[model samples]
Target chain A: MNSTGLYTLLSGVNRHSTAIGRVWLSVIFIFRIMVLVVAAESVWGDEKSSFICNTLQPGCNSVCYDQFFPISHVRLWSLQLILVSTPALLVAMHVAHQQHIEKKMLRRHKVHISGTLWWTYVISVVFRLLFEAVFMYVFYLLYPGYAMVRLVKCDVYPCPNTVDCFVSRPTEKTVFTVFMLAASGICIILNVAEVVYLIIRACARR
Target chain B: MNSTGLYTLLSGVNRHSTAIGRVWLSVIFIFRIMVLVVAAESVWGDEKSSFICNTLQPGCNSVCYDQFFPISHVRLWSLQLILVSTPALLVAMHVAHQQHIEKKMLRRHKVHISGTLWWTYVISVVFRLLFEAVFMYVFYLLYPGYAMVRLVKCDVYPCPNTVDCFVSRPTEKTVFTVFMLAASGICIILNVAEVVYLIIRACARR
Candidate 1:
């Protein structure tokens, strides 16, 4: 199907999701992805140019920067947002597939999503929470203390001696890190709440 | 109800669980708890008696032992086993409660567990896996390298100075640690498999 058709299908299927699921979708799009695109980019845009080391040695600053940040936070958070948001698409695609199967079988009725599909959706949310946790742990390990320090000691190959490197906008970056961490935490909580809501709804219906 | 009646009810309810769940229960009981009672206890029984340090200072050995083993492996594993196995009980209880409510409504027929109950069971299994993962992380943190070194340097308050301390059955303890970790890993795999099996069963049945 065309992208527009797929978008229409996804939008239609999303109506079948629980209330909490709708909220989670909004949080992912508005709070996470949108913020990443509009704000985080500009915050980290000047990282490479403004990064400075108090040494004249060739390649020392870049080397130290590489050592300090093995993975740029902007890229990492972008990846996290994308991966975290991908699982929701499964629900839409699953419903679409079921509808396609029904149509091929000479049945033109609206497809009723089954409990199994709901379970799959819940599992997807669970996996999203897991991915968030893993990314949080990765961030913690890659960024010791999750803090961007103004000065860091760097000693490695191609650096003549240990030099003091000053990162640009350390405070701002730290604030963004905290914000992203909090956003992930909120998403995790929302995921759990949605699961709980689904289970409660299931039990209550009986 | 009496304990015997409760046992009978739970036993009857457990038959409704998936085959993978049955195997998981056996693993928890026979592989984990049974081994913990029969073998792990003896493996760790002599830890306190055989532990020795070079220094003869008062309370030095005890202090160093406390420092090295914050929480004894036996106790920690016992706690883990108890917590990890407890979730399975929720399924039995949930089913039993449903049956009881039905009986109260003047219905004495066999209770057909709902999809919601199955969802609850899966969630319980998910929580069990989470507990296992958490305990694994705790073990990793508490036991650095997960190795029981024969010699350790102790320079605590009770010790006169930094002295060599000897742990008993280092090899045996290390082996047991590895075994338990492997058992946990297997349990985790079984849990994920059970979830997959349930989801597939649900989807295929429809």
Candidate 2:
């Protein structure tokens, strides 16, 4: 898969999408994925090691930490990024599938796919919107108040008693969380606008 | 909106959709919605009142009950049903939108929509599939083991220390949860098959 062919295929597929679709694609790849890979990774680099708990009890700190942070922010955001971008692959797959069909018939046009492909693109937009919404909700629920408190009180099994825990870089994590939430929100708005644009254009007699 | 006009509009739109699309529509209306409104409602009728906790401590029972069950089965399933069926409305909306455009040109055909409308239908199918998948994952997470046990141990604020709580109709609720899960799974399968059918037909060069 590490070939120029993949890039060429996706670029050709992207070219056939609507104008708003192109914008949505740019937002996903440029704004979201790029930021996630480069800046966000380094920002959250030392979360695991730097996490401190005010307890000398062995396994107490780890258990309480696990309980407090059931899912890591880095991992969760990675999952979200992967899922939100997967629908784009569907559009490319459909294009390739159509290309195969066209090849067998020995006839191909500059624009080989139209109605079904457009539907796939629009559906991908909607799917991305839904994924973003669900992930935002999940983030909200997982991180109540969107703030990672420096101090956490834990009183579960393996801990002799209630122990105080401190998360790594609370303010930094909160800022990143808020920034990602805002970015996801923006993408959702873009997706909605794209769908509306498609519908309006389709309705136009021209 | 409760008029024959609405029914006629939807009927006309439905007639233009693919054969598999029509079958999917019927599954949503007849199998899921009908069963949910008619039978499942009664099955989970007495959940709130009939819920019993083994504690008589003032407000402890209610508090623990709420703690154990953050969301009700009835309400969650109702939301799921509404969400899963909502995409069908998009198809109708697109049809009406195109109809308005066609009227402006003083021209109409038995099939006024072709490309975009078909796209809308397929997109709706994908949306339904996503909703079903999300709801299923949520159901699995909310109800571990897909089994609601008769007794629950609650130990939190306002719960007067640790106490055992009994939920209303455990076995019955479990059965309903499983049934709804199975129905959602079937609907997901139908959606996937419909999408495959559409892709195959679109590529057939007919």
Candidate 3:
């Protein structure tokens, strides 16, 4: 009984010391997924009135609907963002689970986390960052100029005159972009702080 | 003391069992980096008669050269390949280091890995797969058609001539794509195998 108590106590210390980092990482992941979920829902779930079309050429009546065409930039952006954040969400959950397990095991056994976990932490964070980079780059690349036009038709069917379309998801896009940029910045800081903290802790242990 | 030894021993078993997955991941990372490094070098390092001029308008000598302009596809591909592989390289090194630390810890401390590690194994693998997907998408997007021509001159100083350019990095591109696809395939198999193995092991433990 005496030894079991000692082991539990040691495990508690270990949990707080190391598991904190994983917690931070998981938090970032959760936030990222949360933002991405809304961003995706806003962009894809709502297809009506996201954009409006005006006549590019002066003519009579032109028919235009508030819908994403087959190949619209906003639609593509929506897909890209969902693609970027889904895997990250999975990774973050895993990290959180690992931390929970590490914390729980103290009651049953005295087990240190494998070193690979740390490396996994770094790799996972950076991987997420890469996706963020791509998301931002693509966002800027596809951001429509002059009223977020979705499409224009000069001589296609359903066009008595020239057509211009605008997007409704522009605010969605802005919110998502802002979240990603903020998430990225925070993740970087968290990672750096953890690394430094780890180094300091390791040195103190010596 | 006896309980500590028992716990440590159990931790040892856990490390080797789960860590084989990380080892496989590291190996894939290493192989990917190697392929990417060579691909990047071959494409970016070469500067030769990849471009030439043909008389299209027939009124003047059209101009072309065996050089890349500011935005050549091969150049872009090379940069993109390097960008994709460099992070993987960093991740691989971290994995190796983490594994090394885990191995070393066995000599001094007993450590039990978190349940999240397996999930990490899955998420990291998939995240990489996504990157590979993007990489391949970009690859096809940038693939020059018909004798590796990277540019078509419509308006410029060399306006009088038709241009055809073939890259020196055709072999390099092929090798890299093959490696990426192959690596992606292998990583998927390994991830699946590891997951199955873990499940089996978990059942056995129960």
The residue-by-residue lDDT of candidate 3 on B162-202, one tens digit each, is 44434445555555656655775675566566656767887
In CAPRI terms, where does candidate 3 land?
incorrect
Order of all candidates by lDDT, from best down to worst? 1, 2, 3
Runs of candidate 3 exceeding 4 Å displacement: A1-184, A188-206, B1-25, B46-113, B116-122, B133-162, B203-206
Q: How does model 2 fare in lDDT?
A: 0.62
- Ten contiguous residues minimizing lDDT sum, candidate 2 chain A: A3-12
* Local accuracy of candidate 1 as per-residue lDDT tens digits, A29-115: 455655665445577773655777887654456556756765567656765654564455445445445555556566413423465
Model 1 residue A129 CA deviation in Å:
1.2
Error of 1 at A130 (Å): 1.1
Model 3: DockQ vs. true structure = 0.01
Off by over 4 Å in 1: A1-16, A107-113, B1-206
- For residues B7-50, write the lDDT of model 2, one tens digit per residue: 22322234333444443334333334434543344445545545
TM-score of 1: 0.46
List interface RMSDs for the candidates, in order: 20.5, 15.8, 19.6
List runs of model 2 lying over 4 Å from the truth: A1-16, A107-113, B1-206
Please list all clashing residue pairs in model 3, or write none if there are none.
A50-A168, A112-B111, B62-B161
lDDT, candidate 3, A1-206, per-residue tens: 34423322211112223443334444454445445444454333444433334443432122344222444544554565455445445555655787798778766123344445445544554554566566656555555332333234444555665554443334334434555566656755665566567668767866
A1-206 per-residue lDDT for model 2 (tens digits): 33333323222335445665554546444555556654345766634447667766544554565566655675567657655655654555455445655675685354436666776777777887898899888888887787768888988654668878787778877777777777788877877887787778767824
